[PDB]
RNA sequence: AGGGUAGGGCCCGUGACUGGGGCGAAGUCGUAACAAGGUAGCUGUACCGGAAGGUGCGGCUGGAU
RNA sequence: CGGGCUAAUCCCCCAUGUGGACCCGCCCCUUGGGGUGUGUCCAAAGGGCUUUGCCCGCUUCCGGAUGGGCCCGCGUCCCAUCAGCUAGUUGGUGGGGUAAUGGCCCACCAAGGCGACGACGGGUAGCCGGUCUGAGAGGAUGGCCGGCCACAGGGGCACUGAGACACGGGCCCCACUCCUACGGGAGGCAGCAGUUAGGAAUCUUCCGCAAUGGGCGCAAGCCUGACGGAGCGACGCCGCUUGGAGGAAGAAGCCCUUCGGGGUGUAAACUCCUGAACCCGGGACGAAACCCCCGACGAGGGGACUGACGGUACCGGGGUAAUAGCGCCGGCCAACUCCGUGCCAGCAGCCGCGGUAAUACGGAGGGCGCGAGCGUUACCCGGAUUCACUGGGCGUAAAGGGCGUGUAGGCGGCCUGGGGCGUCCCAUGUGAAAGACCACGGCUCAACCGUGGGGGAGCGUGGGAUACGCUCAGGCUAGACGG
């Protein structure tokens, strides 16, 4: 399936913070905030001029890691945004972000899409009030996801729940809270979220 | 003879049957002379049959016969209207 | 071992029977009367080619001979007379 | 002689290297059609039709860019490219669908047509297609 | 419809039919250039009538014999030996093609 | 050339000459070794290689190399091969496969075992 | 159909022996070419010679001075 | 085998001829098309219900409709180290024969037919839609599905027939095997599974006609290895899980150390939360028709039976931390140190690693990439712009023929006119559907499948324009030839 394994190690050797949990990637006692240089035996060596190819290698996984997905799952999107109109990288971009357990996430039921995915996974949530285990479904414009009413009952929500009420939400996207029902409104552009990435390197990247 | 039925597409438990004028001497679902309408049988759109009953009436005319449900398909078709 | 073919089969060699019959006889009476355009005797060759006609076309009525054979074979008969009794003559009956 | 067409173009593109300020060239109404185009796009100056030693020509009259600085101070060519496309080894014909565009839309190519000689646009434009003369820049 | 040709006659040998050499011209698939083929046919001749030299015009009719399908729509012109000319004259030049 | 040439004699499509007979247009091929022994390389190197003669359904007869470190192939012993030559021995075109018939992996092997036919400790 | 008699054509495999060729090398003989390579070299043929090769006739310079 | 008997939608004659067949004549047409007249020929079948009427059938003749046969044009692989082939061979007259042209068959007259536009021979291969690669032109390919073809152990043949020269029909011959009571008989999986053999390797001797479709029947119903499903196989694609959050300036072990330290490492442990599977309850869509009731067996409206997959998916309640393996780390090419070893044992796709300090073997620590996958081999396109139409090149790098003459062929200077072959434009028929491409819709997504939409090249038909190519005709003199 999915990475699942050591995460932290993620965030180092790519130089930059992901968050890939929740709090902690905020908090002091994170490996950035303390160990921001390589995993394993020779971090602390200087590096050396990466490749060009290496460098187009980086801003991939960096991306690809974000969401933690299959590199084939992450063939076909931009395989589908390449042969998708326009420009490819909004859109995959847009097709990225598509993603429920994302969304899910970046609706702050869960601090981290890894939490997401398993909320996802495990059903707890719903879409236009259908039930979707499907930690892939591309959400379109127009859906409205609600939490499972017999996982509102929850505690884990609402401490996720309870640290949103009033914070501040994408632009494409609300969030009826204590309803537990938040919205997904249309399909963003790269100005919408400033990741750490430059799409661009990854579309040189499988122009190999 | 030249008969009318529905030719099974779709997948394994997917049925979507084409009601479609071919010989009978044909195999089921091999080479027809015209389509004129198709049939989502399990009901899973609101529009999962139609027929285009002025041309159905025209090979009805022209003495082609329909499989028993096919002609309930021109049935509710309304193909019989006297 | 067996099937309704066996059936299927043997009516056939009866069929086959009657058939190849009826297509000898017409030959026969169909060149008899050629002969006698030749010889002509017209009066009792157009007797003989009539009869072919009907055994023609009589097997024209079963799987024996199809229309257009027998006709082929008809048409091809009745031509061949006349041409041969044309060098002498002339008809006696019909036809025609 | 084979082609006078390349050849015609091919005095055109010798003299135009050596910056003159016209040159000569054997006569006929396909030719003089042909340089028709070449300055109402602005390739020459134009022609007229001149007469060497009993014999008809069409001097045309060429046109350059300006002198430059640098070291190499000629001035820049107008018709930086023109080659001939369509030839007696292989004559070369186009629908009105498959005309090309020169240099994204710098140059032309020049087409013979049932309707006269046209432009890569004009014929777009008209509508038809033909020999394709020539492409140049 | 049945299709009309407009080839040359090369042999009147034969009896009640004769020999049109029929030529076509096309582009290459590739290679653009329009490149010439040629194709002899067996018309029929009834009334023995064409000749040596007779450009005609050979109509898809109904198989007379074997290989013989096109009858004689109709004459164009005659006098036309120099085609024959470089007709035989290929036939003639063979002789030295062989070993 | 001329455009009449290319459409005289056309360019010629060049096919290409395989590399792997013995093998009749197969992935893999059984045979049984014949000449079980060593063989020295030509230069830079020097060394005593393990080869392995076999014969074939393919009714051919084709030295293949032995890979790793310590083998069972002796005369008799059904063997598989591959495709794949070995540059500095010529005479020798193909492979063998380890864990393979009356073939072993290498022993005390843990690491690329996939090439080397050895399955997994604890 | 086919079976038989007889005689031709073509291709694959195999064969005492035989002719060269390729690769390996750490052997033997000499040292032909690469410098004026110690007789300028190459070339066609012809002859000769354990072998690279020599030589005769004519040719090219892709010959040094 | 034979002797003798019996029915019919079986077979035979006669009658009736709307009609249809043939001859000969004539109108039209124009290849044997339709109409017309005299002579000749020919149809048939009954059974059932509620019974002077219905339904099913039977006969002919026209037409429709679909499925075909034959014929033509252009296109369809490799070798010229195959350069000549041909006697049914090419044409004709006349007959046979078929549904029909034909040398498809026979007889006779003639001497003719094919070929460097590659005949003849050999090797290979089932073609197309499409499939994959490809910026494209192009290349490779033709399984699956769809169309057509050809074969039904290896060959030949005709009968039956609307239709075959027929896979589970028949006749014979050959090869093979088996049965046997030893006199004699039988068989043909390239139908669904299955066995044996060959091989690197390809599955179940499963369920059922519920659906769709097919034959037969008025219907009931029957047959149904087509079809619908189950199973096996990581074979390919899609989806999902092996957990989530919190969690020390950081346990042990393990690797490195300049002995202060560094790395594994938020990883674990443990706390909480969520809850794959596995337990129970419920439990389908697919299935509305044929048929039966009224009406009129019809339009239309009412009435039931039926589910192989299957108690499966799916719905509800409850509920366990719950598989990780493979390749790679000298450059290409992302990822580093330590020991062992010492041109030995070894990796290798290329350049090349090892001869006592190996980022290149082995192991380990650590790390890189994917992830129920990971790698290798084989083969196809790509990179290969390296057979170059797009889109290459021949002084010394591989490539100008020793030199001329000349056939075919390719190519061809200025001006006018006709034709309209190439060529261009418009209209139009075909270019099946599947697939590819855009939009959307159903399985909770996707893969898969459905719906609609949107084009072309190519060739068939009609019209048009005339610059260049070509053709026919008229002039000219700038190439050539000549005095
Ligand atoms: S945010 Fe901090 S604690 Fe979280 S994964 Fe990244 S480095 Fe680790
Ligand atoms: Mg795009
Ligand atoms: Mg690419
Ligand atoms: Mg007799
Ligand atoms: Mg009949
Ligand atoms: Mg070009
Ligand atoms: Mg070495
Ligand atoms: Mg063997
Ligand atoms: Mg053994
Ligand atoms: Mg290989
Ligand atoms: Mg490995
Ligand atoms: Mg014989
Ligand atoms: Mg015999
Ligand atoms: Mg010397
Ligand atoms: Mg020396
Ligand atoms: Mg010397
Ligand atoms: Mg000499
Ligand atoms: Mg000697
Ligand atoms: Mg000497
Ligand atoms: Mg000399
Ligand atoms: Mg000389
Ligand atoms: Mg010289
Ligand atoms: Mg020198
Ligand atoms: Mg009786
Ligand atoms: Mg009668
Ligand atoms: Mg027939
Ligand atoms: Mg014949
Ligand atoms: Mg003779
Ligand atoms: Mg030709
Ligand atoms: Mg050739
Ligand atoms: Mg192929
Ligand atoms: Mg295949
Ligand atoms: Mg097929
Ligand atoms: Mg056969
Ligand atoms: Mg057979
Ligand atoms: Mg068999
Ligand atoms: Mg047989
Ligand atoms: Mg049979
Ligand atoms: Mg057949
Ligand atoms: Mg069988
Ligand atoms: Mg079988
Ligand atoms: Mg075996
Ligand atoms: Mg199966
Ligand atoms: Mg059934
Ligand atoms: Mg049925
Ligand atoms: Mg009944
Ligand atoms: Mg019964
Ligand atoms: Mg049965
Ligand atoms: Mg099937
Ligand atoms: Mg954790
Ligand atoms: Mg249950
Ligand atoms: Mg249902
Ligand atoms: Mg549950
Ligand atoms: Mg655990
Ligand atoms: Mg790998
Ligand atoms: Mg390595
Ligand atoms: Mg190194
Ligand atoms: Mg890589
Ligand atoms: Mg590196
Ligand atoms: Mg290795
Ligand atoms: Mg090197
Ligand atoms: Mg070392
Ligand atoms: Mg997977
Ligand atoms: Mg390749
Ligand atoms: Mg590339
Ligand atoms: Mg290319
Ligand atoms: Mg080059
Ligand atoms: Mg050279
Ligand atoms: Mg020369
Ligand atoms: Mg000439
Ligand atoms: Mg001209
Ligand atoms: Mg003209
Ligand atoms: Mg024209
Ligand atoms: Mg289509
Ligand atoms: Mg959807
Ligand atoms: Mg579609
Ligand atoms: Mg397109
Ligand atoms: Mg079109
Ligand atoms: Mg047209
Ligand atoms: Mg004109
Ligand atoms: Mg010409
Ligand atoms: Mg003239
Ligand atoms: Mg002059
Ligand atoms: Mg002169």
Known sequence: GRYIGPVCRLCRREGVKLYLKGERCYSPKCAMERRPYPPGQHGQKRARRPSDYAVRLREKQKLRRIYGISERQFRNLFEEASKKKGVTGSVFLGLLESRLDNVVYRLGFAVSRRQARQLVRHGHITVNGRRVDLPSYRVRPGDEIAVAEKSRNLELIRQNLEAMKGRKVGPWLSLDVEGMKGKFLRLPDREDLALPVNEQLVIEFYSR | ?82 | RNLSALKRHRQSLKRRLRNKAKKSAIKTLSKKAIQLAQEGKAEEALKIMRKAESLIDKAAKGSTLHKNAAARRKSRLMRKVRQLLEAAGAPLIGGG | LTDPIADMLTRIRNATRVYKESTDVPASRFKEEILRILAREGFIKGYERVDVDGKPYLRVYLKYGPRRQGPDPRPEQVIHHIRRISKPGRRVYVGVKEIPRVRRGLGIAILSTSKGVLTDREARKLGVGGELICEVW | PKKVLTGVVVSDKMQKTVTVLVERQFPHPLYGKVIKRSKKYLAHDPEEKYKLGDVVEIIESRPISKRKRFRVLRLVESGRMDLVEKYLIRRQNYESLSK | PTINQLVRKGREKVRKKSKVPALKGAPFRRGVCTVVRTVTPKKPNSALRKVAKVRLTSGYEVTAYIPGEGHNLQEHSVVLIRGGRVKDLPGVRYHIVRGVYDAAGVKDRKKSRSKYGTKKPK
């Open chain 2, 1 to 82: 003879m030249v008969k009318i039925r529905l030719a099974r597409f779709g997948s394994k438990h997917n049925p979507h049957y084409r009601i479609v004028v071919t010989d009978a001497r044909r195999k089921r679902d091999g080479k027809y002379i015209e389509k004129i309408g198709y049939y989502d049988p399990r009901k899973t759109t609101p529009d999962w049959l139609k027929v285009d009953v002025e041309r159905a009436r025209y090979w009805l005319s022209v003495g082609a016969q329909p499989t028993d449900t096919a002609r309930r398909l021109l049935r509710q078709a309304g193909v019989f209207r006297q």
